[PDB]
Amino acid sequence: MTQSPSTLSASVGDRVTITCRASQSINTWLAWYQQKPGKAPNLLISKASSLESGVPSRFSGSGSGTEFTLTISSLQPDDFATYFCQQYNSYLYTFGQGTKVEIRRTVAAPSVFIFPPSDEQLKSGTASVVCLLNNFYPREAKVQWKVDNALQSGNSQESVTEQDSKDSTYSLSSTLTLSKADYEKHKVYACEVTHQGLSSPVTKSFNRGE
Amino acid sequence: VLTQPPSASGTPGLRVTISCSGSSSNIGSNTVNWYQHLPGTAPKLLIHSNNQRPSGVPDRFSGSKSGTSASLAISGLQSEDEADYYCAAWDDSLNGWVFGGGTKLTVLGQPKAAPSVTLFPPSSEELQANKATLVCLISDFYPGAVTVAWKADSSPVKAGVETTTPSKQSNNKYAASSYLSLTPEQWKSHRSYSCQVTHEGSTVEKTVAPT
Amino acid sequence: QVQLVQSGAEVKKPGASVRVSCKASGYTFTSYGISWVRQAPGQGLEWMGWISGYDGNTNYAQKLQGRVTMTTDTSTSTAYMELRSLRSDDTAVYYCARDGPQVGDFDWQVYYYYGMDVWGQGTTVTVSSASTKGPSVFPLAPSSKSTSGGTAALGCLVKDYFPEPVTVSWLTSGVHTFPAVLQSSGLYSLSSVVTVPSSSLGTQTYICNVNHKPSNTKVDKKVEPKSC
Amino acid sequence: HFKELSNYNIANSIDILQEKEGHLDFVIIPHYTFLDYYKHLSYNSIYHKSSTYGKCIAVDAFIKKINEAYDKVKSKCNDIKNDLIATIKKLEHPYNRTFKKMMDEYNTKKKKLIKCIKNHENDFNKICMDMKNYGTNLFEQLSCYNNNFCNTNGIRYHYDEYIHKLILSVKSKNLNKDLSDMTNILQQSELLLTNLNKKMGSYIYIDTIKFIHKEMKHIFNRIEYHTKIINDKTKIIQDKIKLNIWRTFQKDELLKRILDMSNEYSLFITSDHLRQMLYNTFYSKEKHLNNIFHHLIYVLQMKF
Amino acid sequence: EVQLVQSGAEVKKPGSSVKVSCKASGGTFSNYAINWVRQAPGQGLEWMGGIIPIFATTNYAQKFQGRVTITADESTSTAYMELSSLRSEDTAVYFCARDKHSWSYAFDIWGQGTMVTVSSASTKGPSVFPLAPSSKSTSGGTAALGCLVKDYFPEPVTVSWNSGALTSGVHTFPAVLQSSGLYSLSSVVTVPSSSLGTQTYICNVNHKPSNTKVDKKVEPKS
């Protein structure tokens, strides 16, 4: 239940090694599973390094106590998924939280756009302001909201796409939701974005009604 | 070769357990089986494996094993459980089957009934035939287990004693009998002879003497 | 053709119970076990419990103790799992998998040096009080605030629907449809965006197609440019 | 203890079996008995001690999983196998083209299947090694109550539940009568082909009938060989089982005895299994001979 | 299914030999063993040996090994146990039983048993003696009287009173081999003392092996 790389950035052809530490000592029991989006997990390895049949010759196991590893000798384009280790000593199984492997590229910077609420939505008594971060890498980033220069807390939401099949970038949406009355009580609306592809934070803003 | 209690007793509806003690070479390494036996009938298999019983054996019978010992538990005791019970196991050192000693189970129905004892001396007819038999007749005791002793005025003696196995009577109590063979000279040489029947630790005595 | 087949998606109210089936095929059900494991949205896996198809002996996780029951039908080769007194945090994807016949066994379960080799397709179970509601589709108009150079961004806001899922189509290159987020109302919301050349805004038409089968809602929304 | 089954260069010891109508399957004879030898080792081991009996369900679970894994490797050649089935389908049922094109087609599809099996041998070898490791691990850990007085009731149980019923089954069908009849059928087809061949025209079927007759003798020669091994192993097995049943042995002798018995059973079982499957294919092809003969008599009095 | 059935009872002299049979009624000596177990009076079950018919392999309990030979019949479906140099301690019931491999070779089917009695010789023994009424409970007004059946051979005997017409208060005691080597038993009737004045009592004793019937009247002592 101890995964070394929470989120691992790698390259096609690279040798990838993921270690699964434990709590106490398991004699030799540790399963390795692979999981792709929308699909069920698939058993890569059992016991020490007995990769079940149909598992390619690249996946290799290890360990015999509290420190095991899973080694992919050369990462293939179909291997970018998340990896699980199971530790079966006692009657109760333990499923260590998964390790996500995704392809690393040159540091990108997000394109930031902001959308005020449509009058159609202001018909319905609610106001949502949408801040879009498009085509960025890595996934390490931050977004914060300001309303009339006051930092906002507990009224926004963040959703992230997984990697793109062409340029392997991520995209993110941050939506701030107020009531129509609260929205009309204020003027300036801004989202601030920080990312490694940006030397200085990017702020996108507008005035209500303008 | 396996040690069981020679007898056991239980109250209807309760639970009774019968122990069986063995060694590393039999129970320590092989399975133990249990059989029920009512004389006049073939023994019956009760348990064929450790904690297992064939179809037709009620769920009141349970077996267990721990190390070199095993135990049979009978719950909800019923009158049809009165019988002899034998454990058995394969013995690796002997390369054969060994059995436990038979625990006789007395289902308690009638109360603690003391034996009635009648003692007859030798007849004149037998004495004229140069023999002397004393007859000790034992009836109406319950439970069905006694021990018989034939004392001498100042010293003991047993040479020449033959005693029957116990039999259930018509009134659902039990009977037994014991014969002491003497020469006429021995019979005539003592002031009296006594038959003593011990049952559940309590003793009943009768005495006879020459005429 | 060794496989495990699970029942379809379920939607339940808090306090109710759910029953999920896992029908084995292409193998001797009585000689293998079945384990149940759940996966909360965008989270790791949690083992729930296991039952032997031979022995019928069970092993439940302490957390789920008293609320979950697993049963088996050796005649139809089917394993069942029932979770009662459902709670919001039980919303997850439930899986069954082939395993040992004696997991929580006595000494060494070593006669099985493998584990979970075959998995069911999974069953989504949603736990929420209220009933369904179709989405509100609002335009995300392209403007100077969403234009930089020759690239303009635009999209549609698909707000306040229940339950999942919705589908959005537009034009496929540059499209990004974000995963839904859970709001404090208990309703879902998402946006679908696309980047296009800013020179096209005057002559090209952009329409988003939103489908929500649970409520039988279909919406085709035209997205027009906005001035400042 | 010099283990009995072990890996070597087994190039071509494959068996092809058309059991029912176009039901092609094969068996790599050495892997079949290697696997069954360790199957017997595994069971004798768990049955040896009174306590370990209960893992009979876990062992069956492990072996069946290894079979599923082994069958996955065979299933990776099903396309070439179906490619051969259709070619046999063309040969056996000629209802133009000639026996030259057809016979050379059949030999190429057959060699292609065998080449597919050769390319996957390392994948088969890994599964077999996994079975050897599991079984020998359970055998190595075989302990006794008293090392100088090991009980042989493990062998008695194993034989009584895993091999007796067969030895009786085998003596029940009178193996060698089943070959005297097979020869009778082959003789009869030699005579009825000659006694029927009086002209030309109706020819395509004379060629295919000969072909089926040949393949039927090939199958026969196998059945002949296997029944020979079954006959001598049934005797050896009974002879030996008499000596390792009612007594004790020192650990070393007990282990050596288990390996010897397991070798005997593994062989007996292997060639019994094949003997039946080939019996199946011999009659499948016999039933098809009745159809082709009957069709030949139509164009007999068509050409007159 | 299979059905075992011993074949007969016996009576032999010390030093002779006896052969007991056990016949399978299903008709097929399966791969199961048929075992022999005896029980002497007051000794419990004792395993003697077994044979596996279809393989003709035998096993013997050590303490019996030089005296017992077990054999079998593949055609007539019957096993045999032979015991030579019979001793008095060999008087016992002899059982055959089939073991069951799936039930850890427990004995699940049993024959009905064969009694073997080992004794000295054979005679008659016309000693029947009246046992005159004596007081048993004086408060209760009850007396005991009987017949002594002395010096007979072999078993069994039956005792009746007044040619079957007297059943209340009758109790017949088991026989035992006396130091003379002969059996004796006694039959006692409990009666009311008030009837002793004029109620007739005649014990009827039958010894079939010697074709001896003896009647003996039991009257108050005179």
Domains delineated in chain A: 1-103 (2.60.40.10), 111-207 (2.60.40.10)
Number of H helices, E strands in chain D: 11, 4
| CB contact at 8 A, C146 and A114 | yes
Domain ranges of chain D: 1-299
Residue C162 φ then ψ, to 5° = -160, 140
Q: Which residues of C touch D72 (CB under 8 A)?
A: none
Dist. CA B194–CA B203, nearest whole Å: 12
- Strand, helix or coil at A39? coil
Dist. CA E2–CA E78, nearest whole Å: 12
Say whether the D–A interface has 3 or more Cβ pairs within 8 Å: yes
Two tokens at D159?
């034989």
Whether residue D49 lies within 8 A of chain B, CB to CB, comes out as yes
Dist. CA C191–CA B137, nearest whole Å: 107
- Strand, helix or coil at B179? strand
The span from the first CA to the last CA of chain C, in angstroms, equals 61
- Strand, helix or coil at D48? helix
Count of domains observed in chain C: 2
Two tokens at A78?
């179909």
> Strands (DSSP E) along chain D, which ranges?
14-18, 24-28, 150-151, 248-249
Q: CA of D67 to nearest chain E CA: how many angstroms apart?
A: 26
* Chain D: partners with 3+ C-beta pairs within 8 Å: A, B, C, E
Q: Using the beta-carbon criterion (under 8 Å), do C95 and A40 form an inter-chain contact?
A: yes
| CB contact at 8 A, A152 and A146 | yes
Two tokens at D14?
């494959």
> Final residue of a domain: which of B85, B109, B133?
B109
Q: Find the helix or strand (DSSP H, E) in which D169 lies.
A: helix D164-172
Could you tell me the CA-to-CA distances from B180 to B126, B150, E125 in Å, in that order?
13, 8, 20
| CB contact at 8 A, D200 and D277 | no
Mapped to the 3 state alphabet, what secondary structure does C118-177 carry? Answer: CECCCEEEEECCCCCECCEEEEECCCHHHEECCEEEEEEEEEEEECCCCEEECCCCCEEE
In 3D, which of B19, B22, B12 has the Cα closest to residue B60? B12
Helix D251-296 vs helix D164-172: angle between axes, to the nearest 10 degrees?
Answer: 30
Could you tell me the CA-to-CA distances from B195 to B41, B66, B208 in Å, in that order?
34, 45, 9
| CB contact at 8 A, B20 and B100 | yes
- C37 C-beta neighbours (distance < 10 Å), count: 25
DSSP A162-177: ---TTT--EEEEEEEE
Q: Which amino acid is at A43?
A: L
| CB contact at 8 A, C116 and C42 | no
Q: Using the beta-carbon criterion (under 8 Å), do C113 and D60 form an inter-chain contact?
A: no
Dist. CA E62–CA B98, nearest whole Å: 11
Say whether the D–C interface has 3 or more Cβ pairs within 8 Å: yes
Q: Which residue has the tokens 């808090």?
A: C14
Dist. CA B46–CA B18, nearest whole Å: 13
Dist. CA D105–CA B199, nearest whole Å: 99
Dist. CA A104–CA D156, nearest whole Å: 64
Mapped to the 3 state alphabet, what secondary structure does A52-109 carry? Answer: CCCCCCCEECCCCCCEEEEEECCCCCCCCCEEEEEECCCCCCEECCCEEEEECCCCCC
Pairing of strands E114-118, E10-12: parallel
Query: Looking at chain B, which residue has its C-alpha nearest residue D145?
Result: B29
* Residues forming beta bridges with residue B178, ordered by sequence position: B136, B163
Considering the domain architecture, whether residues B2 and B21 belong to the same structural domain is answered as yes
In 3D, which of A112, A101, A111, A110 has the Cα closest to residue A196? A110
Say whether the E–C interface has 3 or more Cβ pairs within 8 Å: no
| CB contact at 8 A, A110 and A135 | yes
At B96, which CATH number?
Answer: 2.60.40.10
Domain span holding position B157: 110-211
> Strands (DSSP E) along chain E, which ranges?
4-6, 10-12, 17-24, 34-40, 44-52, 57-60, 68-73, 78-84, 92-100, 106-110, 114-118, 127-137, 142-152, 158-161, 170-172, 176-177, 183-192, 202-207, 212-217
Breaks, C-N > 2.5 A, in chain D lie after 95
Residue A156 φ then ψ, to 5° = -140, 165
At C118, which CATH number?
Answer: 2.60.40.10
Dist. CA E219–CA E200, nearest whole Å: 7
Q: Which amino acid is at D128?
A: C
Dist. CA B65–CA B31, nearest whole Å: 9
Considering the domain architecture, whether residues B152 and B208 belong to the same structural domain is answered as yes
Whether residue B160 lies within 8 A of chain E, CB to CB, comes out as yes
The interface residues of chain E toward chain B in range 62-121, judged by CB-CB distance below 8 A, are 62, 95, 97, 100, 103-108, 110-113
Q: At a CB cut-off of 8 Å and minimum separation 6, what does B17 contact? A: B71, B72, B73, B74
Q: Find the helix or strand (DSSP H, E) in which C72 lies.
A: strand C68-73
The interface residues of chain E toward chain B in range 149-188, judged by CB-CB distance below 8 A, are 150, 171, 173-180, 184-186, 188
Count of domains observed in chain B: 2
> Final residue of a domain: which of C127, C148, C175?
C127
| CB contact at 8 A, A8 and A16 | yes
> Final residue of a domain: which of B109, B139, B165?
B109
In 3D, which of E54, E114, E44 has the Cα closest to residue E81? E114
Two tokens at C126?
């949603």
Q: CA of E34 to nearest chain B CA: how many angstroms apart?
A: 13
Q: CA of A53 to nearest chain D CA: how many angstroms apart?
A: 6
Could you tell me the CA-to-CA distances from D272 to B202, D32, E153 in Å, in that order?
73, 12, 65
Residue D163 per-residue DSSP state: I
* Residues forming beta bridges with residue C218, ordered by sequence position: C211
The span from the first CA to the last CA of chain E, in angstroms, equals 65
* Within a domain: C48: yes
Sheet harboring C123-127: ordered strands across?
C10-12, C123-127, C92-99, C33-39, C45-52, C58-60
**Considering all CA atoms of chain B, what is the largest pairwise distance in Å, rounded to the nearest integer?**
65
- Strand, helix or coil at B24? coil
> Final residue of a domain: which of B53, B74, B109?
B109
Two tokens at D27?
């068996």
Dist. CA D217–CA D213, nearest whole Å: 6
To 5 degrees, how large is the angle CA D89–CA D90–CA D96?
165
Q: What is the dihedral of CA A178, A182, A185, A186, to 10 degrees?
A: -20
| CB contact at 8 A, E136 and E142 | yes
> Final residue of a domain: which of C95, C127, C159?
C127
Q: Which residues of A touch D126 (CB under 8 A)?
A: 53
**Considering all CA atoms of chain E, what is the largest pairwise distance in Å, rounded to the nearest integer?**
74
- Strand, helix or coil at E167? coil
Considering the domain architecture, whether residues C35 and C119 belong to the same structural domain is answered as yes
Dist. CA C127–CA C94, nearest whole Å: 13
Dist. CA A46–CA A42, nearest whole Å: 11
Domain E121-222 has CATH 3.20.20.70: no
Domain span holding position C14: 3-127
Residue B147 φ then ψ, to 5° = -125, 140
* Residues forming beta bridges with residue C19, ordered by sequence position: C82
Annotate E61-92 with b (16+ C-beta within 10 A) or e (fewer): beebeebbbbebeeeebbbbbebeebeeebbb
> Please, which experimental method was used?
X-ray
Residue E72 per-residue DSSP state: E
